[PDB]
Structure 1
């Protein structure tokens, strides 16, 4: 037996692969979990979360801010059609709505 380290580190991964391996069995999704499946799901969750976290940081950068709030997260969704589709059934607490006007409202 040896001094422990995360299985994610050998996979090249940033989230806890061990508890993903727990959740995939303990949630009764199948009788067996393949050795790659929790590594793969951690990689998928990380990839998609990092992709939206750049848009979150960029939404704060656009508003010239340094601390993320739910408004920057709503702006991150409304800056990308993949997120506008994926999160189309999602409510963001205190995120508000994208500011928009139909041209008919405008004077002249």
Structure 2
């Protein structure tokens, strides 16, 4: 008898693979040695970012009365939120389109 195998992700209550993140860090030539809490912190940060994107994407999808998230929904979610827009200002999403906006000068006007 040795022990049962509990994943570090389950220890931290995460979903992203702490062990995989640790392997990537220590195989990515980022530093000579890697601390113990660094993968735990990084996995939590990545999970939070993905969840934050997905909540808005799902809200956009349900506002469009569809049940599957398509890249159009991701683009609509990203470009509406100011924080995420500033984080991903230099990123192009394939099949994403653009946010519908028309300058008020071009709209017709008279009487």
Task: Quote how far apart the aligned CAs of 1:90 are.
Answer: 0.4
> Quick one: distance in 2 between partners of 1:92 and 1:62?
20
What is the CA distance between 1:7 and its match in structure 2?
1.1
Give the corresponding residue for 2:32.
Answer: 31
Aligned partners of 2:107 and 2:57: how far apart in 1? Answer: 31
Measured after TM superposition, the shift of residue 64 of structure 1 is: 1.4
Alpha carbons 1:74, 1:95 under 8 Å: kept: yes
For 1:4 and 1:12, how far apart are their aligned partners in 2? 15
Shift of 1:101: 0.2
* TM-score where L is the length of structure 1: 0.94
Uncovered stretches (5+) of structure 1, i.e. residues with no partner:
none
Return structure 1 stretches of 4+ with deviation > 4 angstroms: none
Q: CA deviation at 1:39?
A: 0.5
Displacement after TM superposition at 1:4 (Å): 2.4
Contact kept in structure 2, 1:55 and 1:79, CA below 8 Å? no
Q: CA deviation at 1:61?
A: 1.2
CA deviation profile, 1:59-97 (whole Å, cap 9, x unmatched): 101111111100000011022111110110100000000
Cα distance in 2 between the residues matched to 1:72 and 1:24: 31
| Superposed displacement of residue 105, structure 1 | 1.1
Distance 1:64 1:75 in 2: 14
